[PDB]
Amino acid sequence: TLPDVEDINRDNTMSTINAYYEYSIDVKPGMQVGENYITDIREVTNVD
């Protein structure tokens, strides 16, 4: 029900600054734990 506004934090002001930190993860078929910020892999075999 809310109008679409170019103001996301609802402070009535539109910010135009672009000072941020950037992180990235790869999406590949054969990813494993220990790289790409991967900490755990749970393989589920029999899904109903």
Partner 1 sequence: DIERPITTGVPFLLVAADARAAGLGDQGVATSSDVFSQQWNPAKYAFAEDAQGLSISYTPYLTDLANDISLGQVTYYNKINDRSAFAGSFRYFGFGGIELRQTGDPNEPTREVNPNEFALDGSYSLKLSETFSMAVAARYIRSNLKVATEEIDASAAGSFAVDVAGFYQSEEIAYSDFNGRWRAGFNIQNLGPKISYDHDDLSANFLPANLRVGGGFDFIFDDYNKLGVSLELTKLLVPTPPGPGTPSQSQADEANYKKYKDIGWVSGIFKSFGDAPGGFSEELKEITYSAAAEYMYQDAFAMRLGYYHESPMKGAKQFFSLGAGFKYSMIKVDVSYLFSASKVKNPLENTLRFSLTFNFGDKYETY
Rounded distance, CA 5 to CA 14, Å? 9
Interacting stretch for partner 1, rule CB under 8 A, among 2-10, 14-22, 25-33, 36-44?
Answer: 36-44
44 binds partner 1 (CB under 8 A): yes
Instruction: Report in angstroms how near the CB of residue 43 gets to partner 1 at its nearest.
Output: 7
The residue whose two tokens read 């029999």 is 46
Token pair listed for 44: 């589920």
43 binds partner 1 (CB under 8 A): yes
Residue with Cβ nearer partner 1 (5 or 44): 44
Rounded distance, CA 42 to CA 44, Å? 6
